[PDB]
Amino acid sequence: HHHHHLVPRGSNPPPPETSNPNKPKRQTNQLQYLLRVVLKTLWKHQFAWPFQQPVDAVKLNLPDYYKIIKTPMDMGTIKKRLENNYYWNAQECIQDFNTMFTNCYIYNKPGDDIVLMAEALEKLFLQKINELP
Numbered sequence: 001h002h003h004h005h006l007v008p009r010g011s012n013p014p015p016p017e018t019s020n021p022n023k024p025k026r027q028t029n030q031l032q033y034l035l036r037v038v039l040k041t042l043w044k045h046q047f048a049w050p051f052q053q054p055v056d057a058v059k060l061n062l063p064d065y066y067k068i069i070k071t072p073m074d075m076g077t078i079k080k081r082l083e084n085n086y087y088w089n090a091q092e093c094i095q096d097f098n099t100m101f102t103n104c105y106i107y108n109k110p111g112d113d114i115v116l117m118a119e120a121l122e123k124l125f126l127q128k129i130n131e132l133p
């Protein structure tokens with residue numbers, strides 16, 4: 001038989017939502033600090049670029065990524081969410097950050113460049129987090 005299964009093709013899931021009209025939302029002073037200060041200084045770090053958008057498993061040759069990561073999260077998502085006032089409180093935002101890092105530590109091994117980048121960003125996340133309103 002001449003059906004060799006070269007289609008159908010792989011793909012990336014839909015990225016996380018950055019808007020939801022029926023979700024409860026607020027601006028709080030903690031959440032403004034998260035956008036204005038915390039997110040805007042991890043974002044500038046030179047180890048932040050792999051985290052600035054969702055994992056494109058196809059362009060990046062990580063075809064197991066989404067077999068392994070079932071709750072993906074990334075700083076580009078977190079940034080749009082904040083820009084859209086998507087969170088009800090700071091806990092929800094922070095919990096998105098923990099997820100992004102946790103995912104990184106789950107998919108990869110200690111010593112990997114990407115783990116070094118995440119740890120650097122985490123260490124720093126935590127510092128900026130301590131000085132919250």
Ligand SMILES: CCN1C(=O)c2cccc3c(NS(=O)(=O)c4ccccc4)ccc1c23
Nearest residue numbers: 050051055060062103104107108113114117
């Ligand atoms: C941060 C999310 N992420 C990974 O967990 C991961 C593992 C392996 C490669 C890459 C990756 N590929 S990359 O070419 O941009 C890159 C590879 C190694 C080190 C730094 C980036 C981007 C984002 C992630 C990974």
